[PDB]
């Protein structure tokens, strides 16, 4: 717009929450599909669904992590990461079934004198590799689901050797996308790159993806949010620089079925 409007400057508003950004590289809509409610033609569960709307379909800001020369990368799972977030987590646990889209806004600012590139990826059914070489598909429910704090990637695969009392957890190696495939190709998946010299953040609008119209949000995680350093953090001359990466996410057009007593998971 000769009037002023621009790709880099956006304003997102959901329920009682609003996000502003003066340095964005536009925004991405996974597979060109904007989140939507379950249609009658595609519906399964016959009971009147619970649609929290503004109470849950708003912006939740998770615990801010620190990016450094040493960082190999971070990972999160949806809905798992939002499981303890206000009215959204409450409605998710009270219902047998649930479906939801997301507006993922990854925030990470610095300075015209800093360097680095964060590869922000949205992966459908992001199944990760375990820490065991004597057994398989053994990663425990508690460890597979870190909740809000999420997990992290490792530059090296080090097998759990304690056969007696197994760590029973994931060993996601960075260059292999934590799942047996080459990172260089992760780009076939809905994503955006946070290149310090070009932009403050990454905005990904994710639709409800799955082999089913609606499923068990507590048993199954539809989307995986992977953040890896394509180009290592670097500043002026400081040998050990640091910058925060804040992750804010908002559930969308989300709905729930099969209402009963609240589900109290064994998360530890």
């Amino acid at each position: 717009e000769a009037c002023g409007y621009s790709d880099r400057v956006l304003q997102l508003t959901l329920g009682n929450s609003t996000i502003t950004t003066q340095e964005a590289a536009n925004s991405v809509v996974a597979y060109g599909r904007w989140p939507e409610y379950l249609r009658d033609s595609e519906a399964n569960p016959v009971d009147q669904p619970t649609e929290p709307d503004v109470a849950a379909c708003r912006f939740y800001t998770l615990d801010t992590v620190s990016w450094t020369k040493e960082s190999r990368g971070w990972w999160w799972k949806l809905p798992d990461a939002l499981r303890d977030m206000g009215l959204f987590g409450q409605n998710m646990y009270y219902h047998y079934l649930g479906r939801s889209g997301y507006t993922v806004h990854v925030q990470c600012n610095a300075s015209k004198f800093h360097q680095g590139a964060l590869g922000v990826f949205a992966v459908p059914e992001m199944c990760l590799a375990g820490d065991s070489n004597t057994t398989t598909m053994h990663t425990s429910y508690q460890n597979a689901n870190p909740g809000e704090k999420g997990g992290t990637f490792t530059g090296t695969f080090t097998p759990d050797n304690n056969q007696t009392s197994p760590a029973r957890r994931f060993c996601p190696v960075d260059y292999l996308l934590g799942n047996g495939t080459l990172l260089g190709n992760a780009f076939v998946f809905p994503h955006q790159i946070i290149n310090l010299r070009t932009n403050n953040c990454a905005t990904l609008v994710l639709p409800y993806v799955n082999s089913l119209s609606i499923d068990s949000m507590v048993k199954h995680n539809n989307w995986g949010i992977a953040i890896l350093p394509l180009a290592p953090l670097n500043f002026a001359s400081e040998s050990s620089p640091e910058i925060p990466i804040t992750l804010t996410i908002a559930p969308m057009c989300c709905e729930f079925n099969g209402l009963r007593n609240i589900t109290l998971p064994r998360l530890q």
Partner: protein
């Protein structure tokens, strides 16, 4: 309207340029790939394109019978102390690597399944006795149905289950199967569990395998040699060829870069270094 076998777009004649338009310049950060073509960065001539993407289409890419398993059965001498060996195989595309890697280029899939059975037999003992032409019985046992415990027990009656009675030496057996998934599409990957570990309830109880849905997805293939025990022992092998027809696929993924290690995405130590040595400035 555009057909898989339609000729790709013709290359258009392009001359010199001194403008404010910058096709060559862009910003991968946005998540998008520059839709550029030869004529955007260099002077091109007019070319009538005849080439097609016919053979690279989803159906064309998989339109080939692939080996998913090798079943071993036999027919010993009545006297032998050891039991007549009848085969029981849990149906799947993961026992072998080739077809699995191809299907795995994608998250979800949908398709009518064509199963072709190649049967080969042979003599095991430096004997000299012979054996009359064998007749195999390939029975499909769906999850819940009485799984056979003996090469000749009541279950082989197949009153309800689908059975194929194959005759040795004849054209390899073949049958078609519809999209039988309890879901709207097959899940090449399941980022979750079949059970929810409830605090209030004993640890061991709420436990289950990672990435594993229905303990018994599609039941099993129970194969046996219908013929009675023969003085001279004859061992047979049943090779199962699986071909995905009328197929559809969703959400693309990066191909399996390192040696498969079990039914899940798990990798194993010593196999994580696929790429070979090659210098930055060497052609």
């Amino acid at each position: 309207a555009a057909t898989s076998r339609d000729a790709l777009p013709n290359t258009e004649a392009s001359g010199p340029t001194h403008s404010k338009e910058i096709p060559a310049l862009t910003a991968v950060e946005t998540g998008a790939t520059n839709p550029l073509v030869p004529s955007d960065t260099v002077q091109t001539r007019h070319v009538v394109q005849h080439r097609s993407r016919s053979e690279s289409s989803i159906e064309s890419f998989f339109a080939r019978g692939a080996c998913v398993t090798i079943m071993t059965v036999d027919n010993p001498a009545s006297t032998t102390n050891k039991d007549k060996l009848f085969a029981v195989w849990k149906i799947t595309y993961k026992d072998t690597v080739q077809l699995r890697r191809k299907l795995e280029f994608f998250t979800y899939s949908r398709f009518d399944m064509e199963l072709t059975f190649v049967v080969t037999a042979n003599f095991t003992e430096t004997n000299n006795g012979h054996a009359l032409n064998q007749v195999y019985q390939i029975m499909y046992v769906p999850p819940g149905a009485p799984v056979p415990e003996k090469w000749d027990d009541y279950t082989w009656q197949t009153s309800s289950n689908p059975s194929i009675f194959y005759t040795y030496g004849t054209a390899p057996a073949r049958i078609s199967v519809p999209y039988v998934g309890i879901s709207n599409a097959y899940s090449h990957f399941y980022d979750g569990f079949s059970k929810v570990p409830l605090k209030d309830q004993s640890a061991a109880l709420g436990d289950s395998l990672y990435g594993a849905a229905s303990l018994n997805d599609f039941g099993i293939l129970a194969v046996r040699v219908v013929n009675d025990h023969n003085p001279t022992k004859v061992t047979s092998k049943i090779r199962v060829y699986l071909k995905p027809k009328h197929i559809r696929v969703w959400c693309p993924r990066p191909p399996r870069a390192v040696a498969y290690y079990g039914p899940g995405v798990d990798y194993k130590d010593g196999t994580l270094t696929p790429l070979s040595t090659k210098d930055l400035t060497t052609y």
